[PDB]
Amino acid sequence: DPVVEEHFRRSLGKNYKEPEPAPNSVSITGSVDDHFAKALGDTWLQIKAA
């Protein structure tokens, strides 16, 4: 409840436990496909085409 949270945040200052603390994220920098091609070569390319 963010409206309750506000009261607490304001009351405790540096003793306030952030209810959902940072950091959080999911970073994706790659293609599953590219991996299979690298592991399986032509064999993978043949399967994709069906």
Binding site: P2, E5, E6, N24, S25, V26, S27, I28, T29
Partner: protein
């Protein structure tokens, strides 16, 4: 309506956005700040979204389908004129910071897909809860770290000899940003960014558009 005068849908509004370089030194590459919906600014100009499908990943997760489903008043195009003129990073933190507002209390997912020639190169997914403060539900992505791809891109770009060369590189560089309600899966706002270098010596500019049809 108040709708259509800022980057704001019925459920979510963008208040602040920036990409920056820190070292104490700071450099803004790109900056935007808005207010809550109101009657103070005129309607945004429009842009036909079909002119832009080709610049973002299509197929399934794509922009066309995204537009066709979620409310079309949630869709915006920002043209950036980035400021690439800084001599730091010679130490340096590359970050992005944004802030949003809701009338409602919800949990939002921010997904940022960087795109090269319309194919995705990286994706960042962030989940933000609402802090409550006076009347407002605020959401903050504060000093979120840029990926190695983006740092490298900006570095190689920063050091080009000509701005017309910089614009050619940026020509096929785009960022699709879709913000989503984690429960309802409703898209709260979806912003498409296109890019150029600032003509100015210093400073960045932007121009906001509503995406239509």
């Amino acid at each position: 309506s108040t709708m259509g005068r800022s980057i704001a849908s019925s459920k979510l509004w963008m208040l602040e956005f920036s990409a920056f370089l820190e070292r104490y030194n700071k450099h803004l590459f790109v900056h935007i700040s808005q207010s809550s919906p109101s009657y103070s600014d005129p309607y945004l100009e429009t842009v036909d979204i079909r002119q832009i499908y080709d610049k973002f990943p299509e197929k399934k997760g794509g922009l066309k389908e995204l537009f066709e489903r979620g409310p079309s008043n949630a869709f915006f195009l920002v043209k950036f004129w980035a400021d690439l003129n800084t001599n730091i990073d010679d130490s340096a933190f590359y970050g992005v910071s944004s802030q949003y507002e809701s009338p409602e209390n919800m949990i939002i997912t921010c997904s940022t897909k960087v795109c090269s020639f319309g194919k995705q190169v990286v994706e960042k997914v962030e989940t933000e809860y609402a802090r409550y403060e006076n009347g407002h539900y605020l959401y903050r992505i504060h000093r979120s770290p840029l990926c190695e791809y983006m740092i490298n891109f900006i570095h190689k770009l920063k050091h080009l000899p000509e701005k017309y060369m910089m614009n050619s590189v940026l020509e096929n560089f785009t960022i699709l940003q879709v913000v989503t309600n984690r429960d309802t899966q409703e898209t709260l706002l979806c912003i498409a960014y296109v890019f150029e270098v600032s003509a100015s010596e210093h400073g960045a500019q932007h121009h906001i558009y509503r995406l239509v049809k």
